[PDB]
Amino acid sequence: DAFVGTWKLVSSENFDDYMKELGVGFATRKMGGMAKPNCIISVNGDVITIKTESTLKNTEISFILGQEFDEVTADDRKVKSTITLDGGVLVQVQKWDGKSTTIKRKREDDKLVVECVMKGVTCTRVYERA
Template structure:
């Protein structure tokens, strides 16, 4: 399986995350802590907020009563990404 290239750039208070893969390229630009509209790689229209917590970029995506949390952190010179998807308010996680 091919791994995407993830390019994170900072220009003042604007951060850009660009993902490049054979499947699809995506790019988001945001300010920490400010909600923004995002169209995901699978074409979902979500409201996202990204914060910095303990050296990790924590992204929360909300749409149609669902929530995904994506944590991105550098560990031993490698990017570790953990995603938590909350499907129902009753607490089903995968």
């Protein structure tokens, strides 16, 4: 929709703190911090696919809105994820071991803006069309 396309990371704030709050160790935080990923979003019928591509790490999720699915995260957490559409915004929650984190994806002007929250820590990443 507003979301379909190939998106390149152009800015990031508080990503190290967000990863620390998730309990991620130094080596994996170093890798994730210096990564400069592209995000490819596509839709076919009921199914949305989000591909992440970077020099040292690739990931992919596919899902139907409102339907819980199993996901392996970049840092190797095994989580249960649910993604819904609320007022134009894609809202994702990941649940594991009694914990949760939220990831919201929104379109604003020329930007894809992503906000990630874990407890008291908020991270913001911005992507533009490749």
